[PDB]
Design a protein around this ligand. Structure first.
Ligand SMILES: Nc1nc(Nc2cccc(F)c2)sc1C(=O)c1ccccc1
Length: 294
C-alpha cells in the first residue's frame, strides 16, 4: 500500500503474496498479505472481519483488513520465523522433544480456542505456523474457505501442498469438521519428531495412497460410511496397516498413543484439541525457548 514500505517478500501465501512491511506512521513492523477480481465477495469480508476478533496467544493477531482498489489486504502481527524454516534449520540435530511437546501443546490450545468459537483453519502446515524467540508458536494464514473460498490456487500458479490434508477432504467430503485440523497437526507433530514429512504426496491420489499404505486402506470397520464417500472407489488398493512403532521412532509410547488418536481415519473418532490437551503426553510439558537464527 501507500502507508507501508515493503521491506521484503515473506513468501507466496494461499491467496496472494506476503510481505514484511513497516507502517510509515507507527513504524510498527507487520506481515502484509495481498489478495487478488471484479468486485470481491461480501460474505468473505464478513467472515474475515470475524477473524479480527479471534484473538488468542497462539493465534497470529489479525490487525486490519483493508479492501480497496480491487485488492484485499490483511495486516498481521509480524513473527520472526515459520516452523518449516525452523525444522529445516534443525534437520541435523532435530528439535528437542521438550520443544516439540511445547509447540504441539500450544498449537492444540490455539485450535481448542478456534474450534470452541466455531472457526476451522483447514490448511495447517509448517509454513503457516510461526514462532518467536520467546518459545511461542502461533497459527497463521487461516484458509477459511468460509471466507474468500477454497480456489484451485493462491492467485498466480503456485503448487498447493497436500501433505497435511485429512483423508475425508481427499475423499470428497463436502463439509469439513474441526477434525481436519487435528489431522494436519498430527502430521506436523510426526514430522517434527522424525524430521521427514509423514505423507509426502505429490498429487491427491498419491497423497491418499501414501496415507493408505501407512495406516491401512480404510473400510467400514474402522471408518463407517467411508465406502459411500464421493471419491471413494471400490477399486482402491487394499494395504494392511503398518506397525505404528515403525511410523514415528523414537517417539515414546505417550506421544505415539496421542499421535494415533490424532490420525484416526473416522473424523468422529479423531481426538479433539480439548481432549488432546488432557493426554498424559503433556503431564511434563514445559516451555523451552528455541535457538533462533534470525
Ligand atoms: N504474521 C506472519 N509473520 C510472518 N513472518 C515470517 C515468515 C517467514 C520468514 C520470515 F523471516 C518472517 S509470516 C506471517 C503470516 O501471517 C502469514 C501469511 C500468509 C502465509 C503464511 C504466513
Amino acid at each position: 500500500m501507500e502507508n507501508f514500505q515493503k521491506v521484503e517478500k515473506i513468501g507466496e501465501g494461499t491467496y496472494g503474496v506476503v510481505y514484511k512491511a513497516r507502517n510509515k506512521l507507527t513504524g510498527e513492523v507487520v506481515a502484509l498479505k495481498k489478495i487478488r477480481t471484479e468486485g470481491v465477495p461480501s460474505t468473505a469480508i464478513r467472515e474475515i472481519s470475524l477473524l479480527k476478533e479471534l484473538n488468542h496467544p497462539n493465534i497470529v493477531k489479525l490487525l486490519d483488513v483493508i479492501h480497496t482498489e480491487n485488492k484485499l489486504y490483511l495486516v498481521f502481527e509480524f513473527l520472526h520465523q515459520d516452523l518449516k524454516k525452523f525444522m529445516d534449520a534443525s534437520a541435523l540435530t532435530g528439535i528437542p522433544l521438550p520443544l516439540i511437546k511445547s509447540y504441539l501443546f500450544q498449537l492444540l490450545q490455539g485450535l481448542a480456542f478456534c474450534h470452541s468459537h466455531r472457526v476451522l483453519h483447514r490448511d495447517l502446515k509448517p509454513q503457516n505456523l510461526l514462532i518467536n524467540t520467546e518459545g511461542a508458536i502461533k497459527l497463521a494464514d487461516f484458509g477459511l474457505a468460509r471466507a474468500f473460498g477454497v480456489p484451485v490456487r493462491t492467485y498466480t500458479h503456485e503448487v498447493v501442498t497436500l501433505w497435511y490434508r485429512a483423508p475425508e477432504i481427499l475423499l470428497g467430503c463436502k463439509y469439513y469438521s474441526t477434525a481436519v485440523d487435528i489431522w494436519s497437526l498430527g502430521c506436523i507433530f510426526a514430522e517434527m519428531v522424525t524430521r521427514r514429512a509423514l505423507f509426502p504426496g505429490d498429487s491427491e491420489i498419491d497423497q491418499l495412497f501414501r496415507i493408505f499404505r501407512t495406516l491401512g486402506t480404510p473400510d467400514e470397520v474402522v471408518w463407517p460410511g467411508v465406502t459411500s464417500m464421493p471419491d471413494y472407489k471400490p477399486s482402491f488398493p487394499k494395504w494392511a496397516r503398518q506397525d505404528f512403532s515403525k511410523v514415528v521412532p523414537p517417539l515414546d509410547e505417550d506421544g505415539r498413543s496421542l499421535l494415533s488418536q490424532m490420525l484416526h481415519y473416522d473424523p468422529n473418532k479423531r481426538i479433539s484439541a480439548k481432549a488432546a490437551l488432557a493426554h498424559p503426553f503433556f503431564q511434563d510439558v514445559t516451555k523451552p525457548v528455541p535457538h533462533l537464527r534470525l
